[PDB]
């Protein structure tokens, strides 16, 4: 297959012609030529006027005094935020195109929601090398890559100060649309909503939802333990959960997402959002005494979806980005722009979000320490300390740095290996191919990638060619930005997927973004004043201070 070398540049579409030749389709790439390598008139200009991502990043993370002014000039702040949304979203095809089984457009790839979609097509079946033509005939041993490059020896803390509230929010939030269906394969998902539908709270299906709802006052089932609201159990709901045999039945809490019993950090957020849902039911009831259970439930769900997107942009991404510019959740920024209110979760989004280096060597709640053997699947801990203590402890405990290499806890070593194996099963293209896909200059040496000698040396021995390094390993060994949690590629590839999943949501469409959609102005206000602090304050006893970074 002549397309195995990935000849077409700048989003050009490669197509085989006969057995020995290829054709690049350069339609609307802004380029032309055999390989779509020659820039057009208008393309030379924007390229000249476009600073590098690292330059833009420096600007957004400095000049605090300047941004304090910009952040308070609404016309300016909106124009900037609007530009961030549109420019990043242009990098995603919507409606979606490829998946693991189709490196060409097809109705099957478009219509079948059980697949993760793909930002880059899979490496065709019969190629010289696994990645195309670069590198050796076989890829290096995945177990070796993890130990040599990803396995943690010494815990490296996040210089941005990310805490465990951040780490567990990340896992909780993203696991509503990263729901890999392993009984089918890594190419497939159980998240057919393909975005922020809060299925990890209400369940993926109506049958599961019904098991979790109280069907009174629009509320969800719950328990009162030690004076505080907690999720129901498997027994009471008959809603299935993944628990190992060890865990006694009375500690088998049932929430929307089947795997959230895995770790108390997830159950913490599961509990908090559950409280939030029922809290919002009470507010809506006061607002609408004439409403029934169904409209109370449905309306509350739309509120919490709004709250989620609000919090994710203005607190979560805000901290993550390190920007001094104040991001804004405001659907109206797009009502005069071209934008598709739909989303399809990309497999590569899933891969890059394996942020397991975030995880500490031990989990510290109050004055006690827990290793992974004690902490995992142990809801006794949650009940022992309560949510307030959890929030206070997690707010204080620093998370690990994601980029920079060698920071994956040994406890989750096999997860990193599987992430590599599965990406090979799905025939991912190389790291440099994904750099180019998101308008980044490909790395020219291993030393350039890591900005260092030790790992870059190990990498050269394992892959041989820089164009043979795989996506996932490279993301975790890449040179971090100055005092940043991530390197360039993580940010530049992840941001488009994220914002598309957030603003692509139906509630952001002009037909939905009305107070009536949310039961009036009171309901609408809950969304537009939501923050991670107010979420904790309204639902956690004592209203402890919280944040996504350490005090």
Ligand X SMILES: Cc1cccc(Nc2ccccc2C(=O)O)c1C
Ligand Y SMILES: *[C@@H]1O[C@H](CO)[C@@H](O[C@@H]2O[C@H](CO)[C@@H](O[C@H]3O[C@H](CO)[C@@H](O)[C@H](O)[C@@H]3O)[C@H](O)[C@H]2NC(C)=O)[C@H](O)[C@H]1NC(C)=O
Ligand Z SMILES: CCCCCCCCO[C@@H]1O[C@H](CO)[C@@H](O)[C@H](O)[C@H]1O
Active site positions, annotated = 175, 353
CA atoms within 13 A on the CB side of 227: 5
Closest distance to ligand Z from the beta carbon of 55 (Å):
4
Q: Which residue lies nearer to ligand Z by CB, 58 or 341?
A: 58
Q: Write each residue from 485 to 524 as x if it is in contact with ligand X (CB under 6 A), else as -, in one continuous string.
A: -----xx--xx--xx-------------------------
Q: Is 14 helix (H, G, I), strand (E, B) or coil?
A: strand
Residue 453 binds to ligand Y (criterion: CB under 6 A): no
Q: Which residue is nearest to ligand NAG (CB)?
A: 374
Q: Find the binder of ligand [N+] among 187, 212, 239, 420 (CB under 6 A).
A: 239
Candidate list 37, 43, 54, 533; residue touching ligand [N+]; CB under 6 A = 54
- Per partner kind, with CB cut-offs from 5 to 8 A, the member of ligand Z, ligand Y, ligand X, none near residue 482 is ligand Z
Q: Which is nearer to ligand Z, 359 or 527 (CB)?
A: 527
Could you tell me the end-to-end alpha-carbon distance of the chain, in angstroms, rounded to an integer? Answer: 56
Secondary structure letter of residue 226 according to DSSP? T
The C-alpha atoms of residue 162 and residue 550 are separated, in whole angstroms, by 6
Considering only the stretches 157-165, 168-176, 202-210, 483-491, report the one whose residues sit in contact with ligand Y under the rule CB under 6 A.
202-210
* 487: region left, alpha or beta (phi > 0 left; psi from -120 to 50 alpha): beta
DSSP string, 154-201: SPPBPTT-BBHHHHHHHHHHHTTT--B-TTT-TTBBS-TT-S-S-HHH
Partner in contact with 370, chosen from a second copy, ligand X, ligand [N+], none, beta carbon below 5 to 8 Å by kind = none
Residue 230 known to bind ligand: no
Round to whole Å and give the CA distance between 253 and 80.
Answer: 44
Question: Per rule CB under 6 A, is residue 309 in the interface with ligand X?
Answer: no
Which residue of 58, 291, 370, 372 would you call a contact of ligand Z, by CB under 6 A? 58
Per the annotation, does 356 bind a ligand? Answer: yes
Q: How many CB atoms lie within 10 A of CB 97?
A: 21
Strands 223-225 and 31-32, sheet pairing: unpaired
Angle at 305 between CA 338 and CA 491, to 5 degrees: 60
Q: For the CB of residue 184, give the shortest distance to ligand Y in the complex, in Å.
A: 4
Q: How far is the CB of 80 from a second copy (least distance, A)?
A: 21
How far is Cα 402 from Cα 299, in angstroms, rounded to an integer?
Answer: 38
Span 365-394, contacts to ligand NAG by CB under 6 A: 373-374, 378, 380-381, 384
User: Which of a second copy, ligand COH, ligand Z, none does residue 356 bind (CB under 5 to 8 Å by kind)?
Assistant: ligand COH
Is residue 302 involved in binding a second copy (CB under 8 A)?
Answer: yes
> Of ligand Y, a second copy, ligand COH, none, which one does residue 86 interact with (CB within 5 to 8 Å by kind)?
none
Q: Using CB under 6 A, which of 15, 192, 247, 418 touches ligand COH?
A: 418
Query: Which of 174, 496, 197 lies closest to 340 in space, CA to CA?
Result: 496
Residue closer to ligand Y by CB (options 91, 100) is 100
CA distance 419 to 80: 36
What minimum distance in Å lies between the beta carbon of 316 and ligand X? Answer: 7
- Residues 433-462 close enough to bind ligand Z by CB under 6 A: none
Out of ligand [N+], ligand Y, ligand NAG, none, what residue 372 binds, judged by CB under 5 to 8 A for its kind, is ligand [N+]
Element (H, E) at 21: strand 21-25
- What is the distance, to the nearest Å, from the Cα of residue 341 to the centroid of all Cα atoms in its chain? 18
Q: Which helix (H) or strand (E) holds 230?
A: strand 228-230
Look at residue 224 and give its three-state secondary structure.
Answer: strand
- SS3 call for 413: helix
d(CA 54, CA 484): 12
Where does this chain bind ligand X (CB under 6 A)? 84, 317, 320-321, 490-491, 494-495, 498-499
Binding-site annotation: residue ranges for substrate: 88, 323
- Site of interaction with ligand Z (CB under 6 A): 49, 51-52, 54-55, 58-59, 276, 307, 482, 526, 529-530, 534-535, 538-539
């Amino acid at each position: 297959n002549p397309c195995c070398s990935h000849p077409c540049q700048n989003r050009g579409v490669c197509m085989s012609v006969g057995f020995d030749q290829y054709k690049c389709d350069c339609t609307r790439t802004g380029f032309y030529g055999e390989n779509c390598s020659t820039p057009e008139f208008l393309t030379r200009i924007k390229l000249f006027l476009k600073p590098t991502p690292n330059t833009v990043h420096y600007i957004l993370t400095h000049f605090k005094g300047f941004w304090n002014v910009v952040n308070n000039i609404p016309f300016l702040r909106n124009a900037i935020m609007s530009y961030v949304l549109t420019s990043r979203s242009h990098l995603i095809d919507s409606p979606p195109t490829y998946n693991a089984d189709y490196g060409y457009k097809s109705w099957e790839a478009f219509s079948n929601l059980s697949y993760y979609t793909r930002a880059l097509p899979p490496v065709p079946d019969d190629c010289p090398t696994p990645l195309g033509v670069k590198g050796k005939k076989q890829l290096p041993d995945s177990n070796e890559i993890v130990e040599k490059l990803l396995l943690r020896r010494k815990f490296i803390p996040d210089p941005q100060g990310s805490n465990m509230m951040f780490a567990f929010f990340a896992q909780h939030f993203t696991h509503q649309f990263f729901k890999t269906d392993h009984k089918r394969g890594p190419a497939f998902t159980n998240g057919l909503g393909h975005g922020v539908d809060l299925n990890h709270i209400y369940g993926e299906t109506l049958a599961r939802q019904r098991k979790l709802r109280l069907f009174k006052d629009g509320k969800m089932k719950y328990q009162i333990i030690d004076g505080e609201m907690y999720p129901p159990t498997v027994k009471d709901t008959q809603a299935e959960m993944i628990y190992p045999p060890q865990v006694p039945e009375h500690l088998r809490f049932a929430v929307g997402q089947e795997v959230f019993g895995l770790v108390p950090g997830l159950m913490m957020y599961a509990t908090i959002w559950l409280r939030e849902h029922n809290r919002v039911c009470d507010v809506l009831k006061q607002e609408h005494p004439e409403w029934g259970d169904e409209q109370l439930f449905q309306t509350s769900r739309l509120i919490l979806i709004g709250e989620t997107i609000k919090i994710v942009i203005e607190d979560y991404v805000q901290h993550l980005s390190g920007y001094h510019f104040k991001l804004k959740f405001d659907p109206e920024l797009l009502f005069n722009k071209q934008f598709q209110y739909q989303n399809r979760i990309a497999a590569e989004f899933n891969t890059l979000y394996h942020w397991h280096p975030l995880l500490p060597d031990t989990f510290q709640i109050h004055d006690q320490k827990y290793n992974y053997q004690q902490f995992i699947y142990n809801n006794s801990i949650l009940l022992e300390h309560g949510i307030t203590q959890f929030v206070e402890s997690f707010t204080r405990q620093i998370a690990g740095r994601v980029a920079g290499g060698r920071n994956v806890p040994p406890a989750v070593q096999k997860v990193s290996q599987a992430s590599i194996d599965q990406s090979r099963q799905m025939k991912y293209q190389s790291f440099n191919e994904y750099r180019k896909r998101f308008m980044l200059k490909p790395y020219e040496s291993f030393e350039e990638l890591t900005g260092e000698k030790e790992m870059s040396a190990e990498l050269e021995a394992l892959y041989g060619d820089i164009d043979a390094v795989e996506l996932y390993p490279a993301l975790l060994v890449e040179k971090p930005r100055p005092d940043a949690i991530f390197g360039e590629t993580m940010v530049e590839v992840g941001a488009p997927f994220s914002l598309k999943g957030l603003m692509g949501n139906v509630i952001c469409s002009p037909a939905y973004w009305k107070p009536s959609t949310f039961g009036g102005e009171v309901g609408f206000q809950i969304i537009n004043t939501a923050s991670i602090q107010s979420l904790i304050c309204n639902n956690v006893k004592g209203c402890p201070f919280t944040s996504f970074s350490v005090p």
